[PDB]
Amino acid sequence: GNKPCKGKGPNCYFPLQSYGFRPTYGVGHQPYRVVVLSFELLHAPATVCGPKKSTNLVKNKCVNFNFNGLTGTGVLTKSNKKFLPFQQFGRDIVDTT
């Protein structure tokens, strides 16, 4: 309302409001316990992975590879690229890994 109701009374209401929670209370209005879990999926290397083995690193061969969820197919060699210690994966022109 337009009136400045300082102190709980007419037309000024408390924000919080707790409902009644009873074991034999009505169906539909019953309490329910909710966990919602949110992700961030990207093609870049990630932090939390699933449980899988770590195999071995095979070079100079056509293999399927999976680094931190970054999957692909190709030949892995050793290159003299000066990655900074935060920089994880490189990417050339027109966005290819």
């Binding site: 019953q30 879990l37 949110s38 961030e40 932090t47 939390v48 699933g50 931190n68």
Partner: peptide, 13 residues
């Protein structure tokens, strides 16, 4: 494999 995983727990009707 995920980057950022958050979980939000509460109780509703």
């Amino acid at each position: 494999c995920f980057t950022n995983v958050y979980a939000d727990s509460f109780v509703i009707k």
